[PDB]
UniProtKB/Swiss-Prot annotation, chain A:
Shown segment, full-protein numbering: 115 to 171 of 284
Gene: Tpm1
One of the record's GO cellular component terms: myofibril
Source organism (scientific name): Mus musculus (Mouse)
Induction: Induced in stimulated quiescent cells.
Record-given protein name: Tropomyosin alpha-1 chain
Family under the similarity heading: Belongs to the tropomyosin family.
From Swiss-Prot, chain B:
Taxonomic source organism: Mus musculus
Residues that, per the record, bind Ca(2+) 2: D104, N106, D108, Y110, E115
Domain EF-hand: 15-50, 51-86, 91-126, 127-160
Residue numbers binding Ca(2+) 1: D64, D66, S68, T70, E75
Protein name per Swiss-Prot or TrEMBL: Troponin C, slow skeletal and cardiac muscles
Superkingdom assignment: Eukaryota
Gene responsible for this protein: Tnnc1
Keyword Metal-binding (UniProt): yes
Keyword vocabulary terms for this entry: Acetylation, Calcium, Metal-binding, Muscle protein, Phosphoprotein, Repeat
One CC-aspect GO term: sarcomere
Similarity remark: Belongs to the troponin C family.
Lineage: Eukaryota, Metazoa, Chordata, Craniata, Vertebrata
Listed InterPro entries: CALM/Myosin/TropC-like (IPR050230), EF-hand-dom_pair (IPR011992), EF_Hand_1_Ca_BS (IPR018247), EF_hand_dom (IPR002048)
Length: 57, 160
């Protein structure tokens, strides 16, 4: 019984290992995506200020 | 010519924080500090500083004329500090109006160019491309045949 339980516990441990690795991958991908998002936001902000200036004039 | 030059020669830590932040943005170590004027303006707008493209384009037309794209630390720091508003509010409007009425002898509701030339030659400064007609080019906005105190401000407001 103990040896079978050991096999199953290692099974579960390895499954959680793999899932955590996949999650880290998705985390870094979303991280680079978020940086790109921030840059797009700043660009839009600058464009907005510019067009406001033009309209006032 | 010398004000920002003196400030850089006495490089302060408050400006140095942003300077070195943009430096690590630009220079990753053991570099010549190239930092092209186009890239310099890109980062200047990028890192949350003043997003004024006019100074950046002035640099681009002015800097990297060497053809190497590198920008020396002297002029890069000068344009960085002068991109920020470095002026003591240009004295007082009423005080400057009194200064100009001392300057303006005609008191004809304005001041003519020749009085400005007299005061300029009284100052005793060197002449360069921004002389002779640069004042004429800038001040001739509506071309009223004069350089009023208001027109003189329109030309070179914030006189310090």
């Amino acid at each position: 019984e103990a040896e079978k339980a050991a096999d199953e516990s290692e099974r579960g441990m390895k499954v959680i290992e793999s899932r955590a690795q996949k999650d880290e991958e998705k985390m870094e991908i979303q991280e680079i995506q978020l940086k790109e998002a921030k840059h797009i936001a700043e660009d839009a902000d600058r464009k907005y200020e510019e067009v406001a200036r033009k309209l006032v004039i | 010519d010398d004000i920002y030059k003196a400030a850089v020669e006495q490089l302060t830590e408050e400006q140095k924080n942003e300077f070195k932040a943009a430096f690590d943005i630009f220079v990753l170590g053991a570099e010549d500090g190239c930092i092209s004027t186009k890239e310099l303006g890109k980062v200047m707008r990028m890192l949350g500083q003043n997003p004024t493209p006019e100074e950046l384009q002035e640099m681009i037309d002015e800097v990297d004329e060497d053809g190497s794209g590198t920008v020396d630390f002297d002029e890069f720091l000068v344009m960085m500090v002068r991109c920020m508003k470095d002026d003591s509010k240009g004295k007082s409007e009423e005080e400057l109006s009194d200064l100009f009425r001392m300057f303006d002898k005609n008191a004809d509701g304005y001041i003519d160019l020749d009085e400005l030339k007299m005061m300029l030659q009284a100052t005793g400064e060197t002449i360069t491309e921004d002389d002779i007609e640069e004042l004429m080019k800038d001040g001739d906005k509506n071309n009223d045949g004069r350089i009023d105190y208001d027109e003189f401000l329109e030309f070179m407001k914030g006189v310090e």
